[PDB]
């Protein structure tokens, strides 16, 4: 008797509220063997639950390309650009700057426990991670970065797994 429209309206509101509040609960940073920092769950997440936003600076593809080239000139700067399609254009969330936000610290796997989704709030796209399966406390959060480039895989063989 949660009709379709209502289940939809409630889910939209729930997600919007989480994005807007920026509460990043149920997660902690840890050093992960072979990966640098990573994020570990400190509570159970159920399949379909919001985990965290991939928060950063929203930019357009031409600007993103320029930045990517600039960051590449500094070996101390990591790789935090997340490209995606929205309304017939390509955008990028640039999470390169060190902030307190956790989404940018989540590592890669092809057998991860989170899935990235596009969620728009009044015309502004947001990238969010949702649990793809039940996640137990103590598990490292992981999702598929999606970079299948030969050059990327050559430089970072971990992208293949």
């Amino acid at each position: 008797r949660k009709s379709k429209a209502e289940l939809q309206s409630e889910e939209r509101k729930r997600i919007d509220e989480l994005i807007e509040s920026g509460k990043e609960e149920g997660m902690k940073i840890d050093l992960i063997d072979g990966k640098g920092r990573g994020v570990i769950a400190t509570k159970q997440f159920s399949r379909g639950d919001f985990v965290v936003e991939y928060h950063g600076d929203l930019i357009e593809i031409t600007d993103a390309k320029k930045r990517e080239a600039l960051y590449a000139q500094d070996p101390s700067t990591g790789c935090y650009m997340y490209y995606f399609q929205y309304l017939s254009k390509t955008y990028c969330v640039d999470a390169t700057r060190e902030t307190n936000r956790l989404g940018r610290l989540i590592n890669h796997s092809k057998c991860g426990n989170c899935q990235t989704k596009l969620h728009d709030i009044d015309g502004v796209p947001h990238l969010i991670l949702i649990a793809s399966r039940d996640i137990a406390a103590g598990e490292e959060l992981l999702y598929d970065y999606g970079d299948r480039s030969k050059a990327s895989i050559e430089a970072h063989p971990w992208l293949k797994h």
Binding site: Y83, K117, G146, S149, S152
Partner: peptide, 10 residues
């Protein structure tokens, strides 16, 4: 160097 790319999940 790498990036991240989202693939269609409408």
């Amino acid at each position: 160097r790498h990036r991240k790319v989202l693939r269609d999940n409408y």
